[PDB]
């Protein structure tokens, strides 16, 4: 247990420590962290949410900052590192005020005033556009400091392409369910080998060799149960008194499997995707009848496939009518890398696509997938909101300048807290300077001037070695992620700032 000053200085110190752990992942020039456990093992990522979710944080106050990795609205791209780094700075800047004699609650009030204002300023300054070109700029920016190679423009295009494929319009507004975009990976090298498929890709091979390699004009049956011998619930025991019965019993089984397959054939299905197992005898007769079957299909895939093909997931084969069958032009098995995967294409519903990522190393295809997923999210959000913000610390610099003025229009104590919040925002542009290896102090000096001359879009430029126009370089941040990164930071900093005793 710790009380008062000792409790607070300690909590702040903890918050700062965890922020430092992710700090260097910020931006185009972000570094990676290698996280190693005991059994599973090594994870190498630049993703802040991944790093924090995996980290073995001990301290309670640090366990609280780490919780930002789970706020779905913030934990996408650099949102996580931005929220954590900012909480750290908000707590650090507070320490000074606590030292002067300012009460933790007025500091909390200042931050609330500041963040509410900032949330207003950014909706004011938010740039509108649903331009596919801007979408591409969102993705390019999202893929910036990752180990993806040079294929970024190629990836960015895939993203926009996938997003625009499943994006739909409800009452006047564009809604994009990312769950309709199936992303999967396979170790084959190249990356440029990533494919965009108009259908659902399934990491599953056909159960039996004699089954067709490709089915055209497919009537697809999605099945919930196992195509195996089922025993009754109330215990059952078979008693044979006639030696002749043994064969008959052995045959009822065969005939049971024969009927299963008859039911399936009767519905017109020519493809059977089973969520469970399929007995070898059933596989025998399915192949005999020419039906293409896959077994032990993931529920997630079962659901996406029902979505894409219009098929109803059926459990009782007796309810396997032609009404519950899905449709697709082609169901084909084809070898990808070293595996054989099933491709369901030309589905009844066009709003379903897949991205088969390639890249070799394994530990790269994973982050690349990790990357493509964030990219898909950010591009999806923007597609919806239609608004974005300038990157490279441009937003923070504007905010820092405005709040510095808004502080003056506020009363004594709160004013101090609001000037502290304004300083805290500079931790972002400074972090990008430091990471790129440029002089932090002078970049800030320049950045401040330009945004004050009205150059809203001037962020930190690695190239120009200092500040530069993000409008030209195309570095754009989605809005939603910004506002939530600020809000998360404030809510969490306040929670921690208010504690005066840890027992």
């Amino acid at each position: 247990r710790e009380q008062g000053k000792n409790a607070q200085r300690n909590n702040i110190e903890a918050a700062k420590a965890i922020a430092d752990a992710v700090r260097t992942t910020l931006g185009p020039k972000g570094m990676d962290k290698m996280l190693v456990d005991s059994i599973g093992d090594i994870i190498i990522s630049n993703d802040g949410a991944t790093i924090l979710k995996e980290m073995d944080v001990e301290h309670p106050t640090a366990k609280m900052i780490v919780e930002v990795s789970k706020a779905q609205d913030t934990a996408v791209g650099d949102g996580t590192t931005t929220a954590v780094v900012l909480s750290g700075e908000l707590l650090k800047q507070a320490e000074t005020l606590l030292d002067q004699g300012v009460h933790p609650t007025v500091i909390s009030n200042g931050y609330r005033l500041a963040v509410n204002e900032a949330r207003k300023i950014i909706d004011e300054i938010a740039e509108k556009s649903t331009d596919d070109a801007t979408l591409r700029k969102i993705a390019l920016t999202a893929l910036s400091g990752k180990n993806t190679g040079l294929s970024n423009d190629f990836l960015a295009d895939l993203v926009v392409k996938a997003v625009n494929a499943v994006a739909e319009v409800r009452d006047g507004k564009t809604i994009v369910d990312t769950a309709n975009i199936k992303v999967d990976k396979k170790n084959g090298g190249s990356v440029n080998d990533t494919q965009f498929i108009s259908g659902i890709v399934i990491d599953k091979e056909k159960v039996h060799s004699k089954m067709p390699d490709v089915v055209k004009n497919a009537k697809i049956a999605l099945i919930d149960s196992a195509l195996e011998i089922k025993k009754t619930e109330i215990e059952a025991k078979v008693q044979i008194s006639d030696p002749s019965k043994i064969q008959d019993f052995l045959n009822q089984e065969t005939n049971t499997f024969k009927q299963m397959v008859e039911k399936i054939k009767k519905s017109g299905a020519n493809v059977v995707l089973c969520q469970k197992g399929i007995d070898d005898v059933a596989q025998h007769y399915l192949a005999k009848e020419g039906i293409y079957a896959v077994r032990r299909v993931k529920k997630s895939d079962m659901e996406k496939l029902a979505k894409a093909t219009g098929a109803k997931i059926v459990t009782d084969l007796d309810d396997l009518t032609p009404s519950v069958l899905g449709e697709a032009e082609t169901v084909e098995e084809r070898k990808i890398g070293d595996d054989r995967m099933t491709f369901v294409m030309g589905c009844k519903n066009p709003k379903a696509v897949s991205i088969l990522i390639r890249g070799g190393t394994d530990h790269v295809v994973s982050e690349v997938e990790r990357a493509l997923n964030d990219a898909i999210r950010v591009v999806a959000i923007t597609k919806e909101d239609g608004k974005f913000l300038w990157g490279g610390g441009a937003v923070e610099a504007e905010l820092a300048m405005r709040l510095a003025k808004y502080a003056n229009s506020v009363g004594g104590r709160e004013q101090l807290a609001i000037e502290a919040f304004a300083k805290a925002l500079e931790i972002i542009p400074r972090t990008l300077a430091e990471n790129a290896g440029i002089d932090p102090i002078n970049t800030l000096i320049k950045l401040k001037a330009d945004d004050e001359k009205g150059r809203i879009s001037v962020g930190v430029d690695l190239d120009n070695n200092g500040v530069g126009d993000m409008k030209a370089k195309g570095v754009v941040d989605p809005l939603r992620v910004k506002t939530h990164a600020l809000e998360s930071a404030v809510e969490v900093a306040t929670m921690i700032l208010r504690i005066d005793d840890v027992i």
Partner: protein, 502 residues
Amino acid sequence: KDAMKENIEAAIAISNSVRSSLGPRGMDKMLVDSLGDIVITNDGVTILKEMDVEHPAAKMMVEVSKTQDSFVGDGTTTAVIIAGGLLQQAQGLINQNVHPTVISEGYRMASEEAKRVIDEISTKIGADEKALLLKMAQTSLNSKSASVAKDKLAEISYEAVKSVAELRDGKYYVDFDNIQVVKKQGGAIDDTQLINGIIVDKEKVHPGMPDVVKDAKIALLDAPLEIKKPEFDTNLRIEDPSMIQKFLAQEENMLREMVDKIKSVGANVVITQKGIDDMAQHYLSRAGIYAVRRVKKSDMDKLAKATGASIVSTIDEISSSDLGTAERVEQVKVGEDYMTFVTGCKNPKAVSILVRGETEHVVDEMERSITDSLHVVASALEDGAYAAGGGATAAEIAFRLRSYAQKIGGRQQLAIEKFADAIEEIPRALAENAGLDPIDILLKLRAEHAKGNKTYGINVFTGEIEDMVKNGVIEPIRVGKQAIESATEAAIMILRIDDVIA
């Protein structure tokens, strides 16, 4: 700063534990595990998969450097050597405050330009096919303890691949499920031979089965030959002492029937992955059927391809369409052991190599060596081109990167020049290993390539820079592209990591 200093040193350590095994004057490694298992080899893929690396950087170096995409010749040893070079050079550049991101861009670019130089300077295999491929297979065997018999083994490697290679779009495709490699000790390395057929290291299941069957109709099963017990709980209820006889009769009859079905369809041989009941063994024997059991799945797959049989799991539903074909199946004694040779298969693009060595650990390395040769010639046949060995092609790439660096000037340029110095790790290793003077060979090597001698390399025997293709030291174009591919990815991965946390 430090996490990097440490990661890099862990990595380079792996690079050096493999360096002395590169080339004609390369040495092997003895790897002993905790369970006491011993593996003595020159194979860089086995060495890496074997060594107990603890450091996470080392584990990654091993995983990424593995040239996983293909294990042709010494791609992995070459990859690893270059990764260590690239890393060691990056250390220096970082001491000068060059941001790891510049370095990674530079490496990525130089890597691309290097693949280009290779495609460019490569050489298509022409009407010279046989002579080239032989020279390739020998170069490979030259690094191994198999050198001892390189001319004979090279011929075997050539004959085998040529036999199973399909010349499709005027192009060649080689399916390894047509090449059965089996090892048996108790013979000299020279006793190694190529058998036109599929050898299976197993013997007939029952002593009373025939030792040979001409014109065999082979049944390939995947199910065991035993009585089937119902799925629902089952109990025989005997109330009449007389039924006891009728019951056992019904069981034996079930087995007798299973054999009748297989035999009714014409089957002559029965090869199963699973087991064969003792009574079933009696019946097959009595029907004069040659049966082998508990066969390796991989062996099953190869027998299916060569005989054209289908692996059946439902004996009840077996048919003659399922049967495979071969002119003869016969049990032959290979040394101490008895093996089953399925010869004169339906599919004639099916071959076997019986690898011999006197000792177990000798025969093991011979198979490793021969499997390397097969992949070398096969990938050369498939790619259609070859590049000169002896460090020639690396000295060239190095030469051509130093130019390109000055074109892509700036900080990237430093990374690109460093990438060239790293590629030179190959000629250095080769020189060092043969007992030559690195700094001396390197200077001459640079001279020849500057003066346009693309194919000039290190003749470790004479210790002179000569024409590597003339001398026959050549390798598939694929080995170099993959090695530089794997090498740069492994180095970029470590270069980007600035912290290691649990």
